Amino acid sequence: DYLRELLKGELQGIKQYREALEYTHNPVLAKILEDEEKHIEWLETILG
């Protein structure tokens, strides 16, 4: 069950990071959420 508990939680971060560039205007979010966008599918691609 742990994989689904993992996968549900990274999705909770992708949508919040896309808001934060309005207040930070930084290139850091163009690395952080750029990784979180791949990460969910990166865990999943392994399963089969």
Q: Please give the residue ranges that form the binding site for a second copy (CB under 8 A).
A: 2-3, 5-6, 9-10, 12-13, 16-17, 19-20, 23-24, 26, 28-29, 31-32, 35-36, 39, 42-43, 45-46
The Cα 27–Cα 21 span in angstroms is 9
Return phi, psi of residue 25, to 5°.
Answer: 40, 40
Q: Does 37 bind Zn ion (CB under 5 A)?
A: no
The Cα 19–Cα 44 span in angstroms is 25
Least distance in angstroms from the C-beta of 42 to a second copy: 5
Which residues are near Zn ion by CB under 5 A? Answer: 10, 36, 39
